[PDB]
Amino acid sequence: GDRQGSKIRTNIVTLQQKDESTATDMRELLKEEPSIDFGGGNGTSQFLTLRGMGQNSVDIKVDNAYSDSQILYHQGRFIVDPALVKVVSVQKGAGSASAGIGATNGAIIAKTVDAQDLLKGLDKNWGVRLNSGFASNNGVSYGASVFGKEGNFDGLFSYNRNDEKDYEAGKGFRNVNGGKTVPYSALDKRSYLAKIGTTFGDDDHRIVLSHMKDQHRGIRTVREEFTVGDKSSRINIDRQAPAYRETTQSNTNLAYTGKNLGFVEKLDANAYVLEKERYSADDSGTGYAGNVKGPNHTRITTRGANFNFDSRLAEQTLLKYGINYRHQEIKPQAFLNSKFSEQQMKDRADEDTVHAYKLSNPTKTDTGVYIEAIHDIGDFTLTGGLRYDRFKVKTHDGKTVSSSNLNPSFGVIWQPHEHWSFSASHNYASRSPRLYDALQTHGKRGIISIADGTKAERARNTEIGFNYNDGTFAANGSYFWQTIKDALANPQNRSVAVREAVNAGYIKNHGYELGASYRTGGLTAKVGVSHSKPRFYDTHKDKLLSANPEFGAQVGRTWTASLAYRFQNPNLEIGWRGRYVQKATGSILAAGQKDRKGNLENVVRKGFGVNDVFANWKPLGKDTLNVNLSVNNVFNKFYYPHSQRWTNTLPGVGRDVRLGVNYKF
Amino acid sequence: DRQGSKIRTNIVTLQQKDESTATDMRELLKEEPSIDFGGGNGTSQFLTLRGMGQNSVDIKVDNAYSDSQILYHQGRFIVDPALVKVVSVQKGAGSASAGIGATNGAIIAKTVDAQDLLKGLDKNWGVRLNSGFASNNGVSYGASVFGKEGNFDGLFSYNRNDEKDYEAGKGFRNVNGGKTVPYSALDKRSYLAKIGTTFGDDDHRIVLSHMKDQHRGIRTVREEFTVGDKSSRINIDRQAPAYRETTQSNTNLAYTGKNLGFVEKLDANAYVLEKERYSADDSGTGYAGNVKGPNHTRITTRGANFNFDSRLAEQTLLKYGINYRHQEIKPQAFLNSKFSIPTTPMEQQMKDRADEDTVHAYKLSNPTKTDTGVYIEAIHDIGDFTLTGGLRYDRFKVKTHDGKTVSSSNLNPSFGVIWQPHEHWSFSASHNYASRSPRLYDALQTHGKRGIISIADGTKAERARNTEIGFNYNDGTFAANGSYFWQTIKDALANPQVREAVNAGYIKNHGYELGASYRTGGLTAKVGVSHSKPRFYDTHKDKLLSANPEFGAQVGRTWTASLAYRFQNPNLEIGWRGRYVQKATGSILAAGQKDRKGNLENVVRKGFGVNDVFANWKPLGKDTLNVNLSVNNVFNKFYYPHSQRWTNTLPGVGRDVRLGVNYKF
Amino acid sequence: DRQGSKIRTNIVTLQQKDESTATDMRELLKEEPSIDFGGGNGTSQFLTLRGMGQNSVDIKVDNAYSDSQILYHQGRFIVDPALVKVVSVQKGAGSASAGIGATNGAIIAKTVDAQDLLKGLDKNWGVRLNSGFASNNGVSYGASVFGKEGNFDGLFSYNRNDEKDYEAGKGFRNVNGGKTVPYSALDKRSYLAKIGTTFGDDDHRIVLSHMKDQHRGIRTVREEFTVGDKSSRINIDRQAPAYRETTQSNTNLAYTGKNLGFVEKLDANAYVLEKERYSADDSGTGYAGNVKGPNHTRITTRGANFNFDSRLAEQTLLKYGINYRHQEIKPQAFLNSKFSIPTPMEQQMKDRADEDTVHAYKLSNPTKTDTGVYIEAIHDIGDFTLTGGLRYDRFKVKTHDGKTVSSSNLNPSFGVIWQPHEHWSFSASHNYASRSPRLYDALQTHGKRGIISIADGTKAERARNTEIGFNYNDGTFAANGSYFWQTIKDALANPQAVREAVNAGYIKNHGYELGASYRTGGLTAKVGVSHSKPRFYDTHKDKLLSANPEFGAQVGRTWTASLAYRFQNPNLEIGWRGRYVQKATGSILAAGQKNLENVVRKGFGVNDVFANWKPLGKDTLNVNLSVNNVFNKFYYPHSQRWTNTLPGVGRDVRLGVNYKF
Ligand SMILES: CCCCCCCCOCCOCCOCCOCCOCCO
Numbered sequence A: 001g002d003r004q005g006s007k008i009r010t011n012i013v014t015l016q017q018k019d020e021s022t023a024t025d026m027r028e029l030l031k032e033e034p035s036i037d038f039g040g041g042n043g044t045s046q047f048l049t050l051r052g053m054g055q056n057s058v059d060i061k062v063d064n065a066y067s068d069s070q071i072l073y074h075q076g077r078f079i080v081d082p083a084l085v086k087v088v089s090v091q092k093g094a095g096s097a098s099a100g101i102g103a104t105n106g107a108i109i110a111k112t113v114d115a116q117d118l119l120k121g122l123d124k125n126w127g128v129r130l131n132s133g134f135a136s137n138n139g140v141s142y143g144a145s146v147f148g149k150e151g152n153f154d155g156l157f158s159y160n161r162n163d164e165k166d167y168e169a170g171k172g173f174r175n176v177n178g179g180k181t182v183p184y185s186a187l188d189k190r191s192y193l194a195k196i197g198t199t200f201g202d203d204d205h206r207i208v209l210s211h212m213k214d215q216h217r218g219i220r221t222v223r224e225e226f227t228v229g230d231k232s233s234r235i236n237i238d239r240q241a242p243a244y245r246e247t248t249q250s251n252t253n254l255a256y257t258g259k260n261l262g263f264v265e266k267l268d269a270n271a272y273v274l275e276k277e278r279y280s281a282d283d284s285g286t287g288y289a290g291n292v293k294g295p296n297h298t299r300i301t302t303r304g305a306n307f308n309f310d311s312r313l314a315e316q317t318l319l320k321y322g323i324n325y326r327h328q329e330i331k332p333q334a335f336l337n338s339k340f341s342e343q344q345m346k347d348r349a350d351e352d353t354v355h356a357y358k359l360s361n362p363t364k365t366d367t368g369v370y371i372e373a374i375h376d377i378g379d380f381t382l383t384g385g386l387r388y389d390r391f392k393v394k395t396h397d398g399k400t401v402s403s404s405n406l407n408p409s410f411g412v413i414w415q416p417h418e419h420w421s422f423s424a425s426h427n428y429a430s431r432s433p434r435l436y437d438a439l440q441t442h443g444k445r446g447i448i449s450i451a452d453g454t455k456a457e458r459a460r461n462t463e464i465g466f467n468y469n470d471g472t473f474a475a476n477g478s479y480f481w482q483t484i485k486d487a488l489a490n491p492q493n494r495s496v497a498v499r500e501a502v503n504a505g506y507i508k509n510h511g512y513e514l515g516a517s518y519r520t521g522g523l524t525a526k527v528g529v530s531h532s533k534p535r536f537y538d539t540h541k542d543k544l545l546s547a548n549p550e551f552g553a554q555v556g557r558t559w560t561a562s563l564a565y566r567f568q569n570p571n572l573e574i575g576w577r578g579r580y581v582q583k584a585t586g587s588i589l590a591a592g593q594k595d596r597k598g599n600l601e602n603v604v605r606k607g608f609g610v611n612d613v614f615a616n617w618k619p620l621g622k623d624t625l626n627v628n629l630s631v632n633n634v635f636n637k638f639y640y641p642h643s644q645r646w647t648n649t650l651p652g653v654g655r656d657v658r659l660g661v662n663y664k665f
Numbered sequence B: 001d002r003q004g005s006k007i008r009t010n011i012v013t014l015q016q017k018d019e020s021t022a023t024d025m026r027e028l029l030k031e032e033p034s035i036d037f038g039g040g041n042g043t044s045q046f047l048t049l050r051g052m053g054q055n056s057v058d059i060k061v062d063n064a065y066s067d068s069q070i071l072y073h074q075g076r077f078i079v080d081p082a083l084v085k086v087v088s089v090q091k092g093a094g095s096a097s098a099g100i101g102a103t104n105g106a107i108i109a110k111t112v113d114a115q116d117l118l119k120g121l122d123k124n125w126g127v128r129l130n131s132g133f134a135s136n137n138g139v140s141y142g143a144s145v146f147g148k149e150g151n152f153d154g155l156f157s158y159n160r161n162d163e164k165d166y167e168a169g170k171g172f173r174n175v176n177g178g179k180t181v182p183y184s185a186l187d188k189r190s191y192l193a194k195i196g197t198t199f200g201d202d203d204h205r206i207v208l209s210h211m212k213d214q215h216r217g218i219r220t221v222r223e224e225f226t227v228g229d230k231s232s233r234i235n236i237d238r239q240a241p242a243y244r245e246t247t248q249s250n251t252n253l254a255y256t257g258k259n260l261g262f263v264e265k266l267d268a269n270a271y272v273l274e275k276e277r278y279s280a281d282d283s284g285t286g287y288a289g290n291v292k293g294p295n296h297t298r299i300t301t302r303g304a305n306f307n308f309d310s311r312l313a314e315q316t317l318l319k320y321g322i323n324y325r326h327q328e329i330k331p332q333a334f335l336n337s338k339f340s341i342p343t344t345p346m347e348q349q350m351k352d353r354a355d356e357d358t359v360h361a362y363k364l365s366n367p368t369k370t371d372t373g374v375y376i377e378a379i380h381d382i383g384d385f386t387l388t389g390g391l392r393y394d395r396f397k398v399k400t401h402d403g404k405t406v407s408s409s410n411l412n413p414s415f416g417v418i419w420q421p422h423e424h425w426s427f428s429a430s431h432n433y434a435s436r437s438p439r440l441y442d443a444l445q446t447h448g449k450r451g452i453i454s455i456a457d458g459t460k461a462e463r464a465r466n467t468e469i470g471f472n473y474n475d476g477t478f479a480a481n482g483s484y485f486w487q488t489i490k491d492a493l494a495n496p497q498v499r500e501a502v503n504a505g506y507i508k509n510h511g512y513e514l515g516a517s518y519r520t521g522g523l524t525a526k527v528g529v530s531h532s533k534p535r536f537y538d539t540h541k542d543k544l545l546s547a548n549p550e551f552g553a554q555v556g557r558t559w560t561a562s563l564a565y566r567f568q569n570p571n572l573e574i575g576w577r578g579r580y581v582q583k584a585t586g587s588i589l590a591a592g593q594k595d596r597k598g599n600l601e602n603v604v605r606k607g608f609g610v611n612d613v614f615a616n617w618k619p620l621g622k623d624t625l626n627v628n629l630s631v632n633n634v635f636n637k638f639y640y641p642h643s644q645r646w647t648n649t650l651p652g653v654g655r656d657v658r659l660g661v662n663y664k665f
Numbered sequence C: 001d002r003q004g005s006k007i008r009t010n011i012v013t014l015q016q017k018d019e020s021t022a023t024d025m026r027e028l029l030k031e032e033p034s035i036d037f038g039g040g041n042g043t044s045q046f047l048t049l050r051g052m053g054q055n056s057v058d059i060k061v062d063n064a065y066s067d068s069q070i071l072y073h074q075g076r077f078i079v080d081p082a083l084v085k086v087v088s089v090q091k092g093a094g095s096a097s098a099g100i101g102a103t104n105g106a107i108i109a110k111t112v113d114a115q116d117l118l119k120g121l122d123k124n125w126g127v128r129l130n131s132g133f134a135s136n137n138g139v140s141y142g143a144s145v146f147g148k149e150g151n152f153d154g155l156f157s158y159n160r161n162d163e164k165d166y167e168a169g170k171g172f173r174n175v176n177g178g179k180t181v182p183y184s185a186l187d188k189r190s191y192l193a194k195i196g197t198t199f200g201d202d203d204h205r206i207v208l209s210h211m212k213d214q215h216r217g218i219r220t221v222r223e224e225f226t227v228g229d230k231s232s233r234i235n236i237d238r239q240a241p242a243y244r245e246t247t248q249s250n251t252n253l254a255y256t257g258k259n260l261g262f263v264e265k266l267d268a269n270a271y272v273l274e275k276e277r278y279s280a281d282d283s284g285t286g287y288a289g290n291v292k293g294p295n296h297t298r299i300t301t302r303g304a305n306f307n308f309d310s311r312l313a314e315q316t317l318l319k320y321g322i323n324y325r326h327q328e329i330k331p332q333a334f335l336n337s338k339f340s341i342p343t344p345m346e347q348q349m350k351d352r353a354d355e356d357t358v359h360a361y362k363l364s365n366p367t368k369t370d371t372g373v374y375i376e377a378i379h380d381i382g383d384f385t386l387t388g389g390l391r392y393d394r395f396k397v398k399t400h401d402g403k404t405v406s407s408s409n410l411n412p413s414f415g416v417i418w419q420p421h422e423h424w425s426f427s428a429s430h431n432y433a434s435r436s437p438r439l440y441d442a443l444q445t446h447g448k449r450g451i452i453s454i455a456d457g458t459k460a461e462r463a464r465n466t467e468i469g470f471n472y473n474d475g476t477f478a479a480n481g482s483y484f485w486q487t488i489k490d491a492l493a494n495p496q497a498v499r500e501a502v503n504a505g506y507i508k509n510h511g512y513e514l515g516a517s518y519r520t521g522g523l524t525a526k527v528g529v530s531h532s533k534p535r536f537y538d539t540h541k542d543k544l545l546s547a548n549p550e551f552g553a554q555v556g557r558t559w560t561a562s563l564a565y566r567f568q569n570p571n572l573e574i575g576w577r578g579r580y581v582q583k584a585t586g587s588i589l590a591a592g593q594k595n596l597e598n599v600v601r602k603g604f605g606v607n608d609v610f611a612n613w614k615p616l617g618k619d620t621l622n623v624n625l626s627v628n629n630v631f632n633k634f635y636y637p638h639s640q641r642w643t644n645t646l647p648g649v650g651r652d653v654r655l656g657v658n659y660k661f
């Protein structure tokens, strides 16, 4: 099983569990997980943090494809729709050698659903699955899926839609027209999956071809992390200029797995193309896009491939080795550059420089080779590995800078008794600079480059853990220490017309997680707690590190608990679930954060509890029909989650009563 | 049905509807002489019952209904008959169990169910496909899947009707000199999703339902008009056509329990009904505040109804229950601050300048209206008399967009007698009181850019006093019915008095309806005639009632007739149908209506007659396959219907040849 | 087929199309040397046949076709092959039964039917799913449901093809220095709805059918160009991209009765064809009158055809029938009143009197009515088949000023086929046909730029097409050849404040086509070449004929070939396909196009490799892999303007799957 205490949590959500839930986003789906925290709002209003660390350092992997770029820092990076997914797992902090590219701070890892998963409940080779959803606060959802198998072939198509209105925050929230809803938080969210696959050669070989699309549309504000405030605020209707928007994530993926190949005992490979888009119907009121009148379209394309081989050197020792490749390219619609604008000469001088550049699409190439030995001796499992990682960054001025890193990793698990493991690991990993914001790449605000020696961030993550499980009771614990050198955030002047990415500091993180469960005769009891302390230490004279929630947030210590009971007759689980986040204090920046004026901020944030009760009934006895009812945020709590800025941005959803149905025939 | 012609239950049956070629209520209910629809597609249409408009008459689907509107230049939304299984009608003030607002009657529809679709089939699941062509000018299709497992049942239906600009009858010429009515094309879609359980000896049922009904296309600001000459008020610039979606959605939870002791039967309903207007650009829409780019306007209607039947004795039933409805209108944004009165002269701009300040100073909230009623009704059979007594207590509460709140309440008695002396005869009389609360202002004007719309301090509900008599003859071959009615309605409200909603006068209506039918060996013959005379008497100094079609129309005496013959081999029915409306004369306003420049309008409306031939064949003898052929408006008559404005707005559909197949397996 | 190469029936089969990865006609018909398509996506494309453009060549689906256009800066709409079950081609002037306007030929397509989809299945209903992936750069999918109960049948197909800006071949650079062609992305959707009945000993059939084909995306004013440098006439401002939908719809009622006695066969068709352009904002569109906000422009085409075959004797068939078509263009609004000539004085005064006249016109939707009656006798004697025919064609044009002008024509046709041996045919035909004036551009009909009328005597174009051919086929080897000569009198192009459609010259064309094939046990080899020479000759003093690609292009001599092997086990065909077009020279204008242009168009080759696999052996599952333009060749095709408009798609790797159950 999982034996690194709490640092690798495999299959946190299973498809069969997910079908008993009423959630239609990751935020509600992973709320029992204390180290994970989502900001408020719909879609890409949301930021995610893991052990306090943001999506600058934590990735969401679906079918083993992931970008590390972003569209705009006033919104978070795209979070996949769980309707597509069959499993979610998590890996925290710096990973081992087989972990892939950029594993400094960890990842949400998801696999899309397959034909065999959907056929599960049925006694035949094809099937249909319908679902619908109703939410009082305030949405409607449905989907369908058709799937099957003939000879050595299988396939599926799933369409899902979730049409969500402006959500009502908890009690006491008032929106400036004096309503209870959060302006421009409506989103029409659609996804599809198309898969075809073949399994051949004694079932030891499989090729799967997959296309996924995940899309959000609606009238959204420039800056999705805020709504519209009072006309006297910086977040008023004019500055925030809502306009129709679509933001999309698409992935075509080819995947192969072979087993018992003689020359190797298992091989996994993946080649994909991931597209991230922003489309806006009018960008006149969008400063960041260069105020581009009418439709505007921004792309990020990610091409990747991974190969992974497992070779057995002896009954007790496995050798994993492989290679990762990823290329990312950002495409503005048009470069804007030529439009960039008593001793101002120095400025006309600057003006003439920007105009003089001829800009190209920025790219970034990451590649890595790795080996890992996993050796079992006595009731110890020892893991040794190494990665060699290089990147190359070509910014929009054509400037190219690369570097490379050698990253060792060591891990021990000890399992003395059959109910016990204990763990320790010491993992190094590196993470290449990120390209600037895709939406700002047109270069209208000046040129964004990279300094000559700039290098990758490099993490040294040490941690210990234990797992207990005796079949009734379970528990796990993790303590971790993280240092990351050469952190990069905002660019340095070389006057503010031309700037360069630079290493600018270091990062500390440390903390703990506990979890326990109790299982008997239909009763399922659970508790968990997590606290961590991300800190960003400026090292550069112009202090360029950032408290942008993308990097992290100092989240309150977080408790979660659940209590559920499953009746033998009728087949019905009812239960309660709560999440309590304590009061939090302090910026992620050790020197503190400022305020557009430049003034110290006394970052404080309130604790709050959210409580939910739910029910799953299975009127037919099988998992072919699920009727689910939930009432989330029972007490209609008014609150702001912690992973976002601390000023009063976007509250949690007020109370919400949901009825979902899925049905398989 | 024994109130002569005042309650017509099941005017349209599903099995009849499958033999028809109609795709809207207007064509479906054309044999009904008291019902009249204005010209044009979708919400261009106004409906009148006994000459009374959608201000006083509601369409109820699954016992959910709003009384609000989007904009007075269009009619209120008329459900797609593709969704429905039955249509019924109740005219004038209803009895106590009728629900909220029953002063003038209602079209009442129920959506289709699993058991209705399984009708023709000898199994527990099925599919239904349909297809339609219309020469003038459209194409339609749909599919439906439905079934039953254990105590469960469900269905999904999709229907689409893609209609082009229609050609009017002969001699119509459109201003480019074409024969089609500009911007009358609509792409009309509907869905139904339902899931239900029947349990407990078949005496209990819970059904959960979602319906969506949507029209899209390039439509004019003001759908009651097309585009006229560039010299008219209805020219291309003023009418500024643009893409639009207008939508009716309902999620509905319905419960019925039977044989529960003291309660012989219980019916209950809780629902959320959404009405929406979406426009892709509202720059040329004055009424929306000339809002540039996309614009959404919402009306949300939450309701619940509970209804109990208790049996006090074998001949007496007691009905009692409670109705609750909350309506809330949501503009996309209040506009308030941009209130502006042009100079254009005149030299009394003074007070203007003042009013401009008045208006910018408000803070506006979404208007709401809450209606609630408790009622009791006894139905007593003695000798060959059936007596009905009832009472309703109704209250409302109106919160306008300035936050002002005004309520009132009413106690509404109702008495009804049916006498059935012979088995072929009934005679009837009723004396029914009912009330109807003020309507909220137009949803699309709620933003307040044209000024503040409030409600005066003592304003109260309209109150109807409807007396009527009737008879029903039926001997198995020959049938007939007749109704005479008289209607007084006190405290009529129309245009506001910052302006406020006030009571401004009273309404009269009287008239009659006769019908008769003749059925014997294959032949079926029918006739019907109806005439009413709605009159609106001003009481206020500013004359404040309105000749808007919403309120009503003086419609010509209307005759309908049909003759059809069902052959036995093939199973084929061929028939003629005709509808003839005589010339009508006045305004609905007793003192006369005035034309923009304030002059009295000499309201005159031509008579016309429309003839239709149709055929229904059943190639297999069962009802599981219908092939329907029709030609409507055979003589390609050019005319204007009466329920709309009298100037020449939107003509009837010219001649139209239609083919429709439905098939169920 | 026995007219050498002039009539190619069933060039594309449904069964073949299912093994292909192509999602447009251009890639589907690339092995056809006489057909050439311009560069770009959707209506950026021009078609030529024997060097003749869409001004004279039609696309007929289910025997319905318009001859009107939206705007001359884009080509006429080309149907999506996802709808079709067959494509066929008829070149030059047709015989009498060919329909209206058959001066220069037509691509001919039939939409798919229930029986075609049921093909591989052993039951009365079925589903078909498909998906596509394209590296450069798109994704596609669709679904179809279909069946049969008693005497009746029906189908619904939906198809969608979401295409990104395409990357051109190597060395192309776009002005932001990318490799993609700006605004060449299109979201392309089609659906088909059909219901039919077959009755009366299977000798009678009625089919009702509705089809819609639609392209949407951000597109430029003038789709034949992208966006060039800000110093060019094709810069971002002039080209003002904006959201656009362009749509072809057809509702069709079709009847066929057989062996009805005297009448051996009857085919009839009555249909309504809609062509539509919708734009979200036309402010930067000069041609639409700079109409602010949404704008939509329509062309409606109502037609009917009736065709009878009567057998006068075992050896002689008589065909006769009648063709009717009405076309009406509808602007959103006439604009007429705002005509304005920019500000010498002596011309100014003329100018200001001009706008007064324009402003006095009250304008109506232009219409055109075409009708024709025909008879053809087909007579078989010895090993000769002789064909004699006659058409009488009239038209009536009502332009936007209400002016009406008609003419009529009597068009004879003669054809001989001689089949001396069973492996041999030889052919000749001498066919006259006429083609009525086309209405001005739909999108310009508003008349803001002035009034567009028709001169008093103007008449139809009239083609005299003579040609010879041969067909060899012995079961293993096959070859065909065609030579043709075309003269067309009274060509019309550009108008003579108030301007007038006129006859302004003539057109000549000649050339050849040759094909050859070789088929032996799984192996299939094919080659072809085609060369033609369209030439427009001004007759009018103001030189009025046009070099726009609508009318044609001097394409380079074109070679195609392919080589494929089909293995028995697995059921896999792999092959190669080439299309090389030689360098070209010259205008279609005999006197040259203008400031005189020396027209030169470079040659190029395109190579593709492809595989089709049937993992189940039935035709119910096809897995398709192709790589088109393997060597990533950078080029401009010839059926477009010679300047450097829109290049060939670069290299593109595709996988497509269809499955039937
Ligand atoms: C618009 C983007 C969203 C749609 C996603 C689909 C796009 C196309 O993707 C291609 C990937 O292939 C999926 C294969 O599905 C087609 C084959 O159907 C299944 C037949 O195989 C079952 C064999 O028993």
Ligand SMILES: CCCCCCCCOCCOCCOCCOCCOCCO
Pocket (backbone or CB within 6 Å): B133, B134, B135, B657, B658, B659, C197, C206, C251, C252, C253, C270, C271, C272, C302, C303, C304, C326
């Ligand atoms: C200018 C006039 C000529 C126009 C002709 C165009 C006609 C358009 O045809 C297609 C649309 O048809 C829709 C109406 O459907 C009529 C159905 O009649 C068919 C009878 O079939 C009997 C079944 O046994």
